[PDB]
Each structure stands twice: as structure tokens, then as C-alpha cells.
Design an enzyme around this catalytic site. Structure first.
Site, PDB file in Angstrom:
ATOM      1  N   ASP A 117     -15.426   5.018  -8.750  1.00 46.40           N
ATOM      2  CA  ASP A 117     -14.128   4.396  -8.491  1.00 46.40           C
ATOM      3  C   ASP A 117     -14.294   3.057  -7.779  1.00 46.40           C
ATOM      4  O   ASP A 117     -13.688   2.796  -6.737  1.00 46.40           O
ATOM      5  CB  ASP A 117     -13.227   5.337  -7.685  1.00 46.40           C
ATOM      6  CG  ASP A 117     -11.780   4.852  -7.616  1.00 46.40           C
ATOM      7  OD1 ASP A 117     -11.320   4.197  -8.581  1.00 46.40           O
ATOM      8  OD2 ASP A 117     -11.100   5.140  -6.599  1.00 46.40           O
TER       9      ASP A 117
ATOM     10  N   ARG B 287      -9.738  -2.196  -4.140  1.00 47.04           N
ATOM     11  CA  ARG B 287      -9.121  -1.358  -3.109  1.00 47.04           C
ATOM     12  C   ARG B 287     -10.144  -0.532  -2.336  1.00 47.04           C
ATOM     13  O   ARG B 287      -9.845  -0.054  -1.248  1.00 47.04           O
ATOM     14  CB  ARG B 287      -8.051  -0.427  -3.698  1.00 47.04           C
ATOM     15  CG  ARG B 287      -8.561   0.540  -4.724  1.00 47.04           C
ATOM     16  CD  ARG B 287      -7.406   1.268  -5.401  1.00 47.04           C
ATOM     17  NE  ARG B 287      -7.678   1.518  -6.818  1.00 47.04           N
ATOM     18  CZ  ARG B 287      -8.544   2.422  -7.268  1.00 47.04           C
ATOM     19  NH1 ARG B 287      -9.212   3.182  -6.411  1.00 47.04           N
ATOM     20  NH2 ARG B 287      -8.735   2.576  -8.573  1.00 47.04           N
TER      21      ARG B 287
END
Ligand SMILES: Cc1ccn(-c2ccc3c(c2)NCC3(C)C)c(=O)c1-c1ccc2nc(N)ncc2c1
Length: 288
Positions: A156, A160
Site C-alpha cells: 500500500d 498518504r
């Protein structure tokens, strides 16, 4: 594997030496004596909710063990300690990055950007420049080369999950539409590998050089999106990119996982681009 060892003597930290703060579950907190460097240090804590399943516990524990095993790197959130012994909830303690995630930080500097500085430099105090952007990319690439080298796959990687610390040092973290960061083989085959992380890095590059924009602007994320992605369609160059950086993005997004550069190549490439930019900057600074 969870078969990794947990050395309590080295990592265990007393729960009553922490003062839990606000949410970032991941919480910020004050830790007393976790460092022989001081007496009170701000830190981040990931802990199990009060409900937490047995398998959920095993998961946080395996993350803890992986953090121990991997080791320290300036560009990865570093583990400071843990509360695992009976008496309270399982807790994993790491360093704190006060500036937050890179995406949000870049979004807040859109009116504070110049490609490079010249005299009078004070007109660009704390402004972002091409040097900054390439430098964040370079650091994240070194952090990923560090993880890939240890058979560790992020799964991931996105802006962010990049944290900004002091002195413009960025660290790879993991708070763990995400389809926008996933490689074709990950979406259609559910395959995760170092190579699919390289694809994600490319999307991160786009995020950095668009100053925190949302990838694939104005595109519904449906079956057509995935179809077109597999068919070879790619985002266009973002607003603050350099031609070489965009091409590095395209390289990362190659259809064949094995045709994408490795993190070592990216570390090498980004490094050269960082020096070229810096050399260019010296000439711009000298002549004006
Ligand atoms: C509390 C905590 C615990 C574990 N990991 C974590 C999990 C997995 C990994 C790393 C760090 N680094 C490498 C990898 C991907 C194995 C973390 O990022 C964090 C974490 C989360 C948010 C945070 N936010 C700020 N502002 N500062 C520090 C933070 C630290």
C-alpha cells in the site's frame, strides 16, 4: 512468518510510562524514558481496540516482529519499543513524525512553490522546490530498496503512507480508492510482489509531482478503468514534473512486472537526477 523472535529484554516498555494522546487505531503519546537520550519523547502508538479478536492480536504482533527483524533505516518509521507482556493491551511504539502524511503536506504548499531559488532567497522561505520533490522521491526509493532487500513487501505504497519529519526527511509508514495504486497483476491476479510495489511507487511519484493531487483525476474507478489500465492507458504528466521524472513514472508503470526498474535502479537514477538538478541550481544561483 510470525516465527520471528521477540526479544523482550531489548524492546519491552512499561505501559505506565506512556500518556496516550489524540488519534492520528494509531495514537500520539508521551513516552517517559523510552530513550536514554532524554526523559520525555513524543511517539506514535498502534494498539488493539478493547474488543480485538485473537487473530487480530496475532496480526499486530507479526507486524511488531517484522519491524524488529527488518531493522533501522532513516527513511522508514523506526520502532522504539512495545508493550506485549500481560496486564494491558498489545502496543507497538515508534518515532513520531509531527508534520503528517506527505500527500496532505504537498497539498498545502501549492502557493508556496518555485522550481528553484535565486537571490534574494528570503522571498522563498520554506517554499518547496524541484530539489525538494526529487529529494522526497530519492528518500522513499532508498527506504523501499531497504525493504525489498529484506523480502519485505509494502502492498500500500502511496503518498498518504509517507510521513514528513524534520529537516525534510521522509519516512515510509503503514497505517494498516486503493485500486488506483494497484498494479494490473495485483488487480486481476491478486499478486503482490516487489515489482507491484514498484508500480505503486510510480503512482507515488505522480502524487509528489502533482503536489498532492488525487491520481487519475475525473475518472470513475470501475470496470472500464481496470480494463483501460490493463490495456496500457496511463495518467498524463502532472503539473510540477520534469521530463525525466515523468518517464521514470512510465517505466514504473510498464505492463510487464519484470520490465520495471528495481528499487536499486530507481535509487541510482533519482540520485543522478538530484545531482543534475542541484548543479543546474548552482548555475541559476550564480548567474542571477
Ligand atoms: C504506530 C505505527 C506502528 C507501526 N508502523 C509501521 C508498520 C509497518 C511498517 C512500518 C511502520 N515501516 C515498515 C513497514 C512497512 C514494515 C507505523 O507506520 C506506525 C505509525 C503510523 C502513523 C504515524 N503517524 C505519524 N505522524 N508519526 C508516526 C506514525 C507511525
Amino acid at each position: 512468518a510470525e516465527r520471528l523472535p521477540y526479544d523482550a529484554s531489548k524492546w519491552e516498555f512499561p505501559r505506565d510510562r506512556l500518556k496516550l494522546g489524540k488519534p492520528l487505531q494509531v495514537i500520539e503519546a508521551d513516552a517517559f524514558g523510552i530513550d536514554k537520550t532524554a526523559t520525555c519523547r513524543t511517539v506514535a502508538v498502534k494498539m488493539l481496540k478493547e474488543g480485538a479478536t485473537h487473530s487480530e492480536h496475532r496480526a499486530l504482533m507479526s507486524e511488531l516482529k517484522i519491524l524488529i527483524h527488518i531493522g533501522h533505516h532513516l527513511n522508514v518509521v523506526n520502532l522504539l519499543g512495545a508493550c506485549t507482556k500481560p496486564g494491558g493491551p498489545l502496543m507497538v511504539i515508534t518515532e513520531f513524525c509531527k508534520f503528517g502524511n506527505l500527500s496532505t503536506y504537498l497539498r498545502s504548499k501549492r502557493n508556496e512553490f518555485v522550481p528553484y531559488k535565486v537571490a534574494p532567497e528570503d522571498l522563498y522561505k520554506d517554499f518547496l522546490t524541484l530539489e525538494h520533490l526529487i529529494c522526497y522521491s530519492f528518500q522513499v526509493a532508498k527506504g523501499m530498496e531497504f525493504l525489498a532487500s529484506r523480502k519485505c513487501i509494502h502492498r500500500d505504497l502511496a503518498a498518504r503512507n509517507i510521513l514528513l519529519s524534520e529537516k525534510n526527511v521522509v519516512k515510509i509508514c503503514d497505517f494498516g480508492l486503493p485500486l488506483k495504486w494497484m498494479a494490473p497483476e495485483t488487480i486481476f491476479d491478486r499478486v503482490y510482489t516487489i515489482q507491484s510495489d514498484v508500480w505503486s511507487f510510480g503512482v507515488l511519484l505522480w502524487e509528489i509531482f502533482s503536489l498532492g493531487a488525487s491520481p487519475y483525476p475525473g475518472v470513475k474507478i470501475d470496470e472500464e478503468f481496470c480494463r483501460r489500465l490493463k490495456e496500457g492507458t496511463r495518467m498524463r504528466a502532472p503539473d510540477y514534473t520534469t521530463p525525466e521524472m515523468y518517464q521514470t513514472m512510465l517505466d514504473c508503470w510498464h505492463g510487464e512486472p519484470s520490465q520495471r526498474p528495481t528499487f536499486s535502479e530507481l535509487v541510482e537514477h533519482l540520485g543522478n537526477l538530484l545531482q543534475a538538478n542541484a548543479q543546474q541550481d548552482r548555475h541559476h544561483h550564480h548567474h542571477h
